[PDB]
Write a protein that binds this ligand. Sequence first.
Ligand SMILES: Nc1nc2ncc([C@H](O)[C@H](O)CO)nc2c(=O)[nH]1
Ligand SMILES: [Cl-]
Ligand SMILES: [Cl-]
Ligand SMILES: [Cl-]
Ligand SMILES: [Cl-]
Ligand SMILES: [Cl-]
Length: 146
Amino acid sequence: EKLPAPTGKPVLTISGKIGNMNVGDKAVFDLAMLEKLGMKTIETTTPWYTGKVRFDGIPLNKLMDLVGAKGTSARVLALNDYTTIIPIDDFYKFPVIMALKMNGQYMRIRDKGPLFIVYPYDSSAELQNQIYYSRSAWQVSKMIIE
Ligand SMILES: Nc1nc2ncc([C@H](O)[C@H](O)CO)nc2c(=O)[nH]1
Ligand SMILES: [Cl-]
Ligand SMILES: [Cl-]
Ligand SMILES: [Cl-]
Ligand SMILES: [Cl-]
Ligand SMILES: [Cl-]
């Protein structure tokens, strides 16, 4: 089905090698649109917090299927200047999510919110390294499929 236009203010903008766009050559999502997609939880320890933290968000695998991603990598840009490149295969290899809530509460824009890419770190020794930590971009605003 076609992808609708955002009614609310945009929180995420996907562009690049995508097949489904709603605003020009881009897939723009308001918070409401993101929540229409199924949610998944990740309960894991992290190098940013003490103990386990509960992350609720949308799996990036279904997010890629929704925009019809046809690239190999994803250039993730933070609200300011942070940049990270994630191989799309990570989304199919791992149940990575785009977190919206942390401990059942929306993330504050001042902290990691509104969007935060999280991997299930404690689920695999392989995920316990800087590679995956560096790709866990917070305050996400744009995604470019390359
Ligand atoms: N927005 C944003 N997200 C980030 N996600 C992960 C990491 C890494 O843990 C390291 O700090 C840098 O690779 N740094 C950042 C960062 O600076 N900014
Ligand atoms: Cl809004
Ligand atoms: Cl909204
Ligand atoms: Cl769904
Ligand atoms: Cl390609
Ligand atoms: Cl292992």
